[model samples]
Target chain A: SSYTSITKLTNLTEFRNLIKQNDKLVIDFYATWCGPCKMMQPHLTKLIQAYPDVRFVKCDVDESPDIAKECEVTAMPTFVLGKDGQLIGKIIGANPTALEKGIKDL
Target chain B: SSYTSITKLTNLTEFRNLIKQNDKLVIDFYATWCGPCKMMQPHLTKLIQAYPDVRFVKCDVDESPDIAKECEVTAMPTFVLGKDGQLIGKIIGANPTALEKGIKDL
Candidate 1:
């Protein structure tokens, strides 16, 4: 994923490249003013360190509604696991262990 | 697992601990002096990033002789897969496709 800029991920090609690069992605679908989303950050931070092969992409729903809608996301803190270019499964809420298992099982 | 590749490994009780914590592992049994083991680096390299959920432990057969004997290290670069504290199987050489398959199949 591209760093140094926090403008917006309005591009689709770049996002696809990120999924191809990592193979397994753990995406956090969040909003600007969500409290639960903030609560799950530390757990995911720990996971980011523990599982390096997985890409942890944070998509702000406010900024990238298309990306969130494409994934069929309805929750503030939904963690989606994408494998082999398809969204295989999802952990619908702020769940660290389920996220870990979703990544591990795939 | 990271922008920097990460390694998640433990031993004896720690090995059991990691197994308890993680679903499966891709263990690389190598020796510093082995020529063939070096050849297997790039193969394991992508697999670690490719399958972030699976624990990849590169244990030295020479340094950890006890571990070697316990896991039955008859070869220089043995790629062992452990699941739920049981040996899922082993890929006996620097085979990248099979290694990727092993991680994916599990």
Candidate 2:
């Protein structure tokens, strides 16, 4: 349950580097204006603390449109779990319990 | 210049109809929570007034997920210009002068 947080994601190169280094990466696609996304923040932090092995990355949908489009993220508060740089699971919407369960299942 | 405005778009059927009937349709893909989108609103309104024959529609990205996905809209305040139900031009980001020029050129 170790988490690495990055606020600014400017290029794909940096993102690729993060993926390469981490065995398990969880990306949280969020928007500043989304209420649900705000609610999910603390939950995500808690989950990160609980699962110290997973790398959690938060991407702002508005600021990181290219990344969002690359992932085909259509909704706010979307969670994408990747293992060894491969996509394992995707969850859309806000439900901390479901997200945690999904990560555990993954 | 006369413009028809629609605030809410629930389905693609209604969207299709709007595109089919309008000769020159300009859709301003915006989000309620985006500041740049808010700035583009008055400019769009002015354009509608300037071009009476054209139709101007606003699509909320958050609410109209399907349309946004179909159009591959990645950013807020994006503009899609269509003629005879066919896409002609796409403008990403806010530039009122470029948008006006594009419409005029189209």
Candidate 3:
């Protein structure tokens, strides 16, 4: 419940474990080739610090294609919000406003 | 200079042009695969906003191989500080303290 920093989920095992461990989860699906993802990186970092109660994690699309496919992510930086291991909402693209709202709504 | 944001350099032409345009330049040589670079990204963004007089630029080591080789960068996140088109100093790794000092001493 006190996960403040953004954790990088390498495999499905870690990803699944995190979801099971926390009630609120926010996963950032990003790619190396994404320019917009890099632009919005700072904002995401700020959000992680602001919301210490929520578990924040990041998944590299290229590195973990299975996770990307499982999430059905088609964009560069997709913010997937989950509650109690269930997918609640998602904020696509690099819009910080939408991302912030999605987190609050989750 | 008055460049408050980080300008991404794709090619050597743009990189060289930026070096010639600004008197004081702080280049962040980073790779997407580098986790430490991602951790220090927010700090770099904050520095850009704090110092508007210095031009802040970022070069992807994977995307811009020529620029990376030209700078002789061997690390993931190597901050190259320049003054009047000359390489003055470098702050290697994701140490925010060294990075901030390098920017201040520049």
Candidate 4:
């Protein structure tokens, strides 16, 4: 798993501030035991590299339970697409093609 | 304003628990100074009465700053539609028709 480039959200304050600062953001809601989240990390890294204008962030559901609840994340590897500081859409699961297209559409 | 029927959310905890309990919710983000928000209240009342199954909640942007930031409410009277504990769509004005349609679609 490539974890270097992706910023980790620890709390609601951090998530709120980051969302305000970045116009476009893709948040990955993952758990430690999630195998798909691990597989999706490299793809997220690639997307991060590809789109410098977009912000890619990771949030552990157990660690940042507040942020996860605020996002209403029910499933692991849920990719939330945010624009203009508001959550517009989300893709649930570990489909790289949908993730790539989501970013492109953003 | 017919606020008696609509539940007021003062903090993130209230918002989170409410979202979890209710499958469909329409959040009305408003401020005291926003005239359109005041005008939209009656429409919200009608909707609340119409859609008894859907949860209709009100969040004062100035009072519940955390919830507002979580929803990324830049505009007044932003009606956020949520289903299954996750935010799906938002209408950024006091357009009663849009609010109705957004809820109906949700």
Pitting candidate 2 against candidate 3, the one with the higher TM-score is 2
What tier of docking accuracy does candidate 1 attain? incorrect
lDDT string, candidate 4, A48-104, tens digits:
888888988889875776898898886668999989888889999879998889889
- What are the candidates' individual DockQ scores? 0.01, 0.02, 0.01, 0.02
Q: Rate residue B32 of model 1 by lDDT.
A: 81
Model 3 lDDT tens row, B1-106: 2223458889988888888877788999876534566677888878887877878889877577689899988665889998887778888887999888878887
The superposed Cα distance between candidate 1 and the true structure at residue A97, in angstroms, equals 33
Q: What lDDT tens digits, residue by residue, belong to model 1 across residues B48-101?
A: 778877878777788777767666676778777766555545566767777787
Per-model root-mean-square deviation over C-alphas: 18.1, 12.1, 14.2, 10.6
Positional deviation of B86 in candidate 1, in angstroms? 2.7
Per-residue lDDT tens digits for candidate 1, residues A7-70, read 2345567666666766778777775434456567777777877777776787876567678777
User: lDDT scores for all predictions?
Assistant: 0.69, 0.75, 0.78, 0.81
Give the lowest summed-lDDT range of ten residues in model 2 chain A: A1-10
TM-score of each: 0.45, 0.52, 0.50, 0.55
Tens digit of per-residue lDDT, candidate 2, span B8-100? 556788777887877787888876544466667778878988887777888876678799787888666788998877778898877898899
- Tell me model 1's lDDT, rounded to 2 decimals: 0.69
Worst 10 residues of 1 chain B by lDDT: B1-10
List, in the given order, the native-contact fraction of each candidate: 0.00, 0.00, 0.00, 0.00
Docking class of 3: incorrect
